Amino acid sequence: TQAEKTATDLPPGFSGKAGSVNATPGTKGLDGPTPLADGSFDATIFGPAKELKSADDILNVHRRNAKDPFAVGAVDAPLVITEFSDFECPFCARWSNQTEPTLMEEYVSKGLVRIEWNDLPVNGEHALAAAKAGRAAAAQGKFDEFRKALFEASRNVSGHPNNTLKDFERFARNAGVKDMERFSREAQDSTYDEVLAKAADYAHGLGVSGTPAFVVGTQYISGAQPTEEFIKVIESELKKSPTFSTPSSH
């Protein structure tokens, strides 16, 4: 033939990026999370969009909450990735350092995927302290930057870094947190105790048994699996659900 064929459907194992190329990017929430009245952000956000009662409710884990400082990407992206993670976990660090940046480049930056963080501290006192510090950073709109700085500092650590207050403060500075007095206070006091307890209870109610864990659209993935696996699941989910429209009733 003296023509360029239009792409036709292939078995999913050889479909490449057909899913994402046919998907419709989200156009809302591109400027990040919506602030509270005082200009800060709601760092008490956790949990699902709605209670899950059965496997049919799997999409309920994705909040799509425009006020959520723990989310990156369009609030109306056609695919959401819900992540359960621990700041002391080396598999969580590896996913953040090695997999997340390609997902940002290929999908999140294009409006195709939203990634939402959920706390699941499994590693004891340093993990809980890190999660409190993460919420303190989120209150000032710097969660993603704080998270990236913390995990970058763990890039060569095969165990737990055992981070403490001075470490969290450095990551906050790296992240550009403006009010360090508020950060240091909220990273240590009772501000986020209740929400962190509730977030852990929520994850345990789903049966999440280790970190990191992901719900990619409708599919569960446990652990820092190879980047290529996340890509295949993302492409499959985007082929199945190429568009998202916020319900008018909301």
φ, ψ at 220 (rounded to 5°): -90, 135
Closest by CA position to 96, among listed 145, 140, 58, 47: 145
> What is the domain extent for residue 158?
1-250
The count of structural domains within the chain is 1
In angstroms, how far is the first alpha carbon of the chain from the final one? 51
Q: Are 160 and 123 in contact (CB under 8 A)?
A: yes
Contact predicate 163/87, CB 8 Å:
yes
Helix (H) or strand (E) holding 119: strand 113-119
The rounded distance, in Å, linking the Cα atoms of 236 and 248 is 27
Q: Where are the beta strands (DSSP E) in 41-102?
A: 71-72, 79-85
Answer for the pair 15, 9: CB distance below 8 angstroms, yes or no.
yes
CB-based burial of residue 159 (10 Å sphere; 0-12 exposed, 13-18 middle, 19+ buried)? exposed
User: Count of CB atoms within 10 A of residue 2's CB?
Assistant: 3
Can you give the resolution of this entry in Å?
1.5
Within a 10 A sphere around the Cβ of 14, how many other Cβ atoms? 7
Q: Are strands 79-85 and 219-222 parallel, antiparallel or unpaired?
A: unpaired
